[PDB]
Enzyme design. Structure first.
Site, short mmCIF file in Angstrom:
data_model
loop_
_atom_site.label_atom_id
_atom_site.label_comp_id
_atom_site.label_asym_id
_atom_site.label_seq_id
_atom_site.Cartn_x
_atom_site.Cartn_y
_atom_site.Cartn_z
N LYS A 49 41.82 52.89 45.68
CA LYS A 49 41.69 51.77 44.74
C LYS A 49 40.59 52.05 43.70
N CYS A 140 33.95 32.90 52.43
CA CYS A 140 33.78 34.25 52.92
C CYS A 140 32.48 34.46 53.71
N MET A 141 31.34 34.49 53.01
CA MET A 141 30.06 34.90 53.60
C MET A 141 29.20 33.76 54.11
N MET A 308 35.84 38.88 58.38
CA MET A 308 36.35 37.55 58.16
C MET A 308 36.89 36.84 59.38
N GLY A 345 32.31 41.11 52.00
CA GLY A 345 33.58 41.45 51.39
C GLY A 345 33.58 41.79 49.92
N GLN A 346 33.08 40.86 49.10
CA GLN A 346 33.01 40.98 47.63
C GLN A 346 31.84 41.87 47.17
N1 LIG Z 1 42.00 46.35 50.37
C1 LIG Z 1 41.15 45.28 50.23
N2 LIG Z 1 39.86 45.40 50.66
C2 LIG Z 1 38.95 44.36 50.60
C3 LIG Z 1 39.41 43.08 50.04
C4 LIG Z 1 40.81 43.03 49.56
O1 LIG Z 1 41.23 41.97 49.07
N3 LIG Z 1 41.61 44.11 49.69
N4 LIG Z 1 38.55 42.03 49.94
C5 LIG Z 1 37.15 42.16 50.29
C6 LIG Z 1 36.60 40.86 50.76
S1 LIG Z 1 36.21 39.65 49.62
C7 LIG Z 1 36.50 40.61 52.08
S2 LIG Z 1 35.98 39.06 52.60
C8 LIG Z 1 36.82 41.67 53.13
C9 LIG Z 1 37.69 41.12 54.24
O2 LIG Z 1 37.94 42.15 55.20
P1 LIG Z 1 38.11 41.85 56.76
O3 LIG Z 1 37.65 40.52 57.24
O4 LIG Z 1 37.62 43.08 57.51
O5 LIG Z 1 39.71 41.82 56.69
P2 LIG Z 1 40.70 40.61 57.06
O6 LIG Z 1 42.08 41.20 56.92
O7 LIG Z 1 40.39 39.32 56.35
O8 LIG Z 1 40.42 40.24 58.58
C10 LIG Z 1 39.63 40.96 59.52
C11 LIG Z 1 40.30 40.81 60.87
O9 LIG Z 1 39.96 39.55 61.44
C12 LIG Z 1 40.99 39.28 62.41
N5 LIG Z 1 41.07 38.01 63.16
C13 LIG Z 1 42.07 37.06 63.13
N6 LIG Z 1 41.81 36.06 64.01
C14 LIG Z 1 40.64 36.35 64.63
C15 LIG Z 1 39.78 35.74 65.66
O10 LIG Z 1 40.09 34.64 66.18
N7 LIG Z 1 38.65 36.38 66.05
C16 LIG Z 1 38.28 37.55 65.49
N8 LIG Z 1 37.11 38.14 65.88
N9 LIG Z 1 39.04 38.18 64.54
C17 LIG Z 1 40.19 37.64 64.08
C18 LIG Z 1 42.28 39.59 61.70
O11 LIG Z 1 43.25 39.90 62.71
C19 LIG Z 1 41.84 40.74 60.79
O12 LIG Z 1 42.40 42.00 61.18
O13 LIG Z 1 37.57 42.72 52.54
C20 LIG Z 1 36.96 43.23 51.36
N10 LIG Z 1 37.66 44.45 51.01
N1 LIG Z 2 44.64 32.90 53.30
C1 LIG Z 2 43.48 33.47 52.94
N2 LIG Z 2 42.91 33.17 51.75
C2 LIG Z 2 41.72 33.73 51.36
C3 LIG Z 2 41.07 34.73 52.22
C4 LIG Z 2 41.76 35.00 53.47
O1 LIG Z 2 41.25 35.77 54.27
N3 LIG Z 2 42.90 34.34 53.77
N4 LIG Z 2 39.90 35.30 51.85
C5 LIG Z 2 38.99 34.50 51.04
C6 LIG Z 2 37.87 35.37 50.58
S1 LIG Z 2 36.88 36.10 51.77
C7 LIG Z 2 37.65 35.56 49.27
S2 LIG Z 2 36.43 36.56 48.74
C8 LIG Z 2 38.49 34.90 48.20
C9 LIG Z 2 38.62 35.76 46.95
O2 LIG Z 2 39.54 35.09 46.11
P1 LIG Z 2 39.55 35.14 44.51
O3 LIG Z 2 38.14 35.49 44.07
O4 LIG Z 2 40.17 33.85 44.05
O5 LIG Z 2 40.63 36.31 44.18
P2 LIG Z 2 40.41 37.54 43.16
O6 LIG Z 2 41.73 38.11 42.75
O7 LIG Z 2 39.27 38.47 43.60
O8 LIG Z 2 39.69 36.79 41.95
C10 LIG Z 2 39.26 37.57 40.84
C11 LIG Z 2 39.76 36.91 39.57
O9 LIG Z 2 38.89 37.36 38.54
C12 LIG Z 2 39.63 37.89 37.45
N5 LIG Z 2 38.73 38.83 36.77
C13 LIG Z 2 38.60 40.15 36.89
N6 LIG Z 2 37.62 40.64 36.07
C14 LIG Z 2 37.12 39.61 35.38
C15 LIG Z 2 36.06 39.39 34.35
O10 LIG Z 2 35.35 40.29 33.85
N7 LIG Z 2 35.89 38.14 33.93
C16 LIG Z 2 36.61 37.12 34.41
N8 LIG Z 2 36.34 35.90 33.95
N9 LIG Z 2 37.60 37.23 35.34
C17 LIG Z 2 37.87 38.43 35.85
C18 LIG Z 2 40.81 38.53 38.13
O11 LIG Z 2 41.85 38.78 37.20
C19 LIG Z 2 41.11 37.45 39.17
O12 LIG Z 2 41.93 36.40 38.63
O13 LIG Z 2 39.79 34.67 48.73
C20 LIG Z 2 39.74 33.83 49.88
N10 LIG Z 2 41.12 33.45 50.17
S1 SF4 Z 3 33.57 50.06 46.88
FE1 SF4 Z 3 35.31 49.57 48.26
S2 SF4 Z 3 37.19 49.69 47.00
FE2 SF4 Z 3 35.50 50.64 45.86
S3 SF4 Z 3 35.79 52.90 46.34
FE3 SF4 Z 3 34.23 52.14 47.79
S4 SF4 Z 3 35.36 51.46 49.66
FE4 SF4 Z 3 36.90 51.84 47.97
O1 LIG Z 4 28.99 31.47 50.78
CL1 LIG Z 4 27.37 32.27 50.66
O2 LIG Z 4 26.21 31.33 51.69
O3 LIG Z 4 27.52 33.99 51.23
O4 LIG Z 4 26.89 32.48 48.92
MO LIG Z 5 35.53 37.66 50.65
#
Ligand SMILES: Nc1nc2c(c(=O)[nH]1)N[C@H]1C(S)=C(S)[C@@H](COP(=O)(O)OP(=O)(O)OC[C@H]3O[C@@H](n4cnc5c(=O)[nH]c(N)nc54)[C@H](O)[C@@H]3O)O[C@H]1N2
Ligand SMILES: Nc1nc2c(c(=O)[nH]1)N[C@H]1C(S)=C(S)[C@@H](COP(=O)(O)OP(=O)(O)OC[C@H]3O[C@@H](n4cnc5c(=O)[nH]c(N)nc54)[C@H](O)[C@@H]3O)O[C@H]1N2
Ligand code: SF4
Ligand SMILES: [O-][Cl+3]([O-])([O-])[O-]
Ligand SMILES: [Mo]
Length: 723
Positions: A49, A140-141, A308, A345-346
């Site tokens: 990526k 998330c965090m 997460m 995550g972010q």
């Molecule tokens: N490719 C890719 N990478 C990313 C992101 C992305 O969108 N795409 N987003 C980034 C961000 S913002 C985040 S928050 C991270 C998220 O990354 P992770 O949290 O590592 O990934 P997830 O797929 O949300 O879930 C982690 C695992 O939690 C598990 N889980 C489900 N139920 C339970 C439970 O009851 N207990 C426990 N212990 N685990 C459970 C799920 O099965 C899952 O495999 O990834 C970051 N990196």
């Molecule tokens: N069901 C389910 N839902 C989830 C989660 C899950 O585990 N399960 N994970 C949650 C978590 S941990 C997270 S972090 C959130 C993340 O969720 P979001 O933050 O809503 O998803 P993203 O696609 O990262 O959002 C980025 C947005 O920013 C825009 N963007 C990119 N670059 C720029 C820029 O320079 N300026 C501006 N203004 N915009 C830009 C992109 O086009 C996109 O629309 O999702 C949550 N939602």
């Molecule tokens: S910051 Fe995350 S998405 Fe970007 S290159 Fe490193 S592991 Fe891959």
């Molecule tokens: O939702 Cl936070 O307490 O990681 O900014």
């Molecule tokens: Mo996240």
């Protein structure tokens, strides 16, 4: 010899909280190459990526002019920047003028530059006088924050990525590190490779790529990991694998009513969590509680990593506390390789929103809204009149969109997030976002974000390395990204958009005295000075040369800090402290073990909805796919949403692989192609959320942790049936 980059501009990957340093190759003002920054933690390495970031930077599918929607349900049409800024500024000023400051909000992100979130937070909290500032890290965090603060009295890991090279046991819980944090997973895999005696325990309801290097995969029942980790503690205590020299000096105990206790009271609590009972509850062999407990305690250095699956939970904060309990009872902490390490995550949830306190209840550099000393600290620093910062927290994210729907919040800015896609319980949230009297301004790089369907005004922002700014990743590392190329069209850096807006909305211009992100960085450097977040020594010049610095970093000659809370390593521990550790976040310098009762989901399966349903990351797609969906090679294996179904469940119920199924919950029903495999433990199903054609957050419940207000995306009750 070349054609082909003339210069390389140092920055940070736009994706994960792994926070890889990148070098962007530019020729004739245009980006043509990317490589990993050899000098940052990732040592030159990127995942697929990150290596395919240049097609995204160069995509012509961009929001490149301000756009207005004249009427609710009309088409977005072009508008000048001066018309757009005036419309925006007048609307907000007007709403405050009639209804007070709490009618307006900021909804931002851990993808915003730290300087963007700093300015926004300041405009609202100290400019308008409303604490309605929140952002997507709350989704998330926020659980990792409540966990770190109640256990240690301060936020953020006390170790770093370096700790990975020296653990001999990884306890990786609720984390698909392979697909979420690929470069970090490689560092872990590399560690087991170099040292074959390294034990890796992956605890997760789903068998993911991550478990394929594990010595033990604990496929526990969704929601039971708390009873699991308590049981581990029982085993560690029962088999005398604990560290009394450590917990006697460095640890306090709080009972299940959150009242002071003792080791003896811990033992008695843990009696309720014997391996035999817990095994039945978790649906795992008892030998796994024993092996996991023993690996963890007996190992020379243990590192826990989670994401997460632990945070996205109504028992989120408590689950984080429970991980710290193990490291605290064994003293697997404050030593190289031994540490309790929440994965972020972010890319900038840490620096932008957490550290800079750009949530509703917080103030920058560890400060808190309900604390009067803190508010006064901020009023001094922001040149504010006394009592200008409101004494009560604004709306947290879930509450914020509920307040929108009720018309209590009339104006809202959304910046670098896609809430109409990623918020939980979307049918409710879509209703709220289409209040006929709401004024929603979106700052958004990509025309295809579903959220733009609700927006009244759109502003065209400078994307990624089209402007300069700092990202703070998961390990306390502050890395700068320099401008490599100009923004296309009429795109503008959001620092500047934020300042011009504030001025036009009558905010005191002393409050937004910023020409660029460098000016804001210096104010923030000051605002952190003398707090335990102190990063005063990270000048712009230092961050241009360095590939990141790790805080605390209180002066220019200070290298930055690896081991927090350690005498002689953390500048926040006085050099003449009597003890070798100092958890100065607590009044007595002792960290806290919490006897948190283990419960479950807010929505547990029953006879009607017999399955746990979850949602997860996939490696090829970043969140809502507005960016990765522009890279042809990132769909060659995941163009569309699906559901993962367990093979025993499928065989029992008559569902075959690739069958179309209806997943149904109390909230909605959705048809999806079925993947049948051993990935999901029985009784569980799973969906990705990247597909804007398949808005699975329509299915999930809205329920939040009562302390962190993080939604429980990871668990609800569902039923599955043939279409
Ligand atoms: N490719 C890719 N990478 C990313 C992101 C992305 O969108 N795409 N987003 C980034 C961000 S913002 C985040 S928050 C991270 C998220 O990354 P992770 O949290 O590592 O990934 P997830 O797929 O949300 O879930 C982690 C695992 O939690 C598990 N889980 C489900 N139920 C339970 C439970 O009851 N207990 C426990 N212990 N685990 C459970 C799920 O099965 C899952 O495999 O990834 C970051 N990196
Ligand atoms: N069901 C389910 N839902 C989830 C989660 C899950 O585990 N399960 N994970 C949650 C978590 S941990 C997270 S972090 C959130 C993340 O969720 P979001 O933050 O809503 O998803 P993203 O696609 O990262 O959002 C980025 C947005 O920013 C825009 N963007 C990119 N670059 C720029 C820029 O320079 N300026 C501006 N203004 N915009 C830009 C992109 O086009 C996109 O629309 O999702 C949550 N939602
Ligand atoms: S910051 Fe995350 S998405 Fe970007 S290159 Fe490193 S592991 Fe891959
Ligand atoms: O939702 Cl936070 O307490 O990681 O900014
Ligand atoms: Mo996240």
């Amino acid at each position: 010899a070349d054609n082909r980059p003339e210069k390389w501009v140092k920055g940070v990957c736009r994706y994960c909280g792994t926070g890889c340093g990148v070098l962007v190759g530019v020729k004739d003002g245009k980006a043509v190459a990317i490589q990993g920054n050899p000098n940052n933690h990732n040592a030159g390495l990127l995942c697929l990526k990150g290596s395919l970031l240049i097609p995204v930077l160069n995509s012509k599918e961009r929001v490149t002019q301000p756009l207005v929607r004249r009427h609710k349900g009309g088409k977005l049409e072009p508008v000048s920047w001066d018309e757009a800024l005036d419309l925006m500024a007048s609307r907000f000023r007007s709403s405050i003028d009639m209804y007070g400051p709490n009618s307006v909000a900021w909804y931002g992100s851990g993808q915003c530059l730290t300087e963007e979130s700093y300015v926004a937070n300041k405009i609202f909290k100290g400019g308008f006088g409303t604490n309605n500032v929140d952002g997507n890290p709350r989704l998330c965090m926020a659980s990792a924050v409540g966990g770190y603060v109640t256990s240690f009295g301060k936020d953020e890991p006390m170790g770093t990525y370096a700790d990975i090279d020296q653990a001999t046991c990884f306890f990786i819980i609720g984390s698909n590190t392979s697909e979420a944090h690929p470069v970090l997973f490689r560092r872990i895999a590399r560690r087991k490779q170099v040292e074959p005696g390294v034990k890796i325990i992956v605890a997760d309801p789903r068998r993911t790529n991550t478990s394929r290097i594990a010595d033990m995969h604990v496929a526990f029942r969704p929601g039971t990991d708390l009873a699991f980790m308590h049981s581990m503690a029982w085993v560690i205590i029962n088999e005398e694998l604990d560290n009394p020299r450590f917990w006697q000096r460095y640890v306090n105990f709080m009972d299940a009513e959150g009242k002071p206790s003792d080791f003896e009271g811990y033992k008695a609590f843990l009696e309720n969590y014997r391996p035999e009972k817990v095994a039945e509850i978790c649906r795992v062999p008892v030998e796994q509680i024993y092996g996991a407990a023993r690996a963890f305690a007996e190992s020379a250095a243990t590192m826990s990593l989670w994401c997460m699956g632990i945070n996205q939970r109504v028992q989120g904060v408590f689950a984080n506390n429970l991980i710290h309990n193990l490291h605290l009872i064994t003293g697997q902490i404050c030593r190289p390789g031994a540490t309790s390490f929440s994965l972020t995550g972010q890319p900038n949830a840490c620096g932008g929103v957490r550290d800079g306190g750009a949530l509703s209840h917080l103030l920058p550099a560890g400060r808190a809204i309900p604390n009067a000393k803190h508010r006064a600290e901020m009023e001094k620093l922001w040149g504010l009149p006394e009592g200008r910062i409101a004494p009560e927290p604004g709306y947290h994210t879930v509450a914020l969109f509920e307040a929108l729907g009720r018309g209590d919040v009339k104006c809202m800015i959304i910046c670098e997030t896609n809430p109409a896609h990623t918020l939980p319980n979307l049918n409710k949230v879509h209703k709220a976002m289409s209040h006929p009297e709401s004024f929603i301004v979106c700052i958004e790089a990509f025309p295809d974000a579903v959220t733009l369907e609700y927006a009244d005004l759109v502003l065209p922002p400078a994307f990624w390395c089209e402007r300069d700014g700092v990202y703070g990743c998961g390990e306390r590392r502050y890395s700068l990204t320099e401008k490599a190329v100009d923004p296309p069209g009429q795109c503008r850096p959001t620092v500047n958009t934020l300042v011009e807006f504030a001025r036009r909305a009558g905010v005191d211009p002393q409050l937004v005295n910023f020409r660029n992100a460098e000016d804001v960085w210096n104010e923030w450097r000051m605002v952190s000075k003398g707090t335990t977040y102190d990063f005063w020594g990270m000048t712009r010049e230092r961050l241009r040369k360095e590939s990141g610095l790790i805080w605390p970093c209180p002066s220019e000659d200070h290298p930055g800090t690896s081991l927090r809370y350690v005498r002689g390593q953390d500048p926040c521990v006085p050099a003449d402290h009597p003890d070798r550790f100092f958890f100065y976040g607590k009044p007595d310098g002792r960290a806290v073990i919490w006897m948190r009762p283990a419960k479950g989901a807010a929505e547990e399966p029953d006879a009607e909805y017999p399955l746990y349903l979850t949602s997860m990351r996939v490696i090829d797609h970043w969140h809502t796919a507005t960016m990765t969906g522009k890279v042809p090679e990132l769909q060659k294996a995941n163009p569309i949403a699906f559901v993962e179904i367990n093979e025993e469940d499928a065989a029992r119920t008559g569902i075959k692989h690739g069958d179309s199924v209806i997943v149904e919950t109390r909230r909605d029903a959705m048809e999806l192609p079925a993947r049948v495999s051993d990935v999901c433990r029985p009784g569980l199903i799973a969906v990705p959320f990247f597909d804007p054609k398949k808005l699975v957050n329509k299915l999930f419940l809205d329920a939040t942790d009562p302390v962190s207000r993080e939604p429980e995306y990871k668990i609800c009750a569902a039923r599955v049936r043939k279409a």
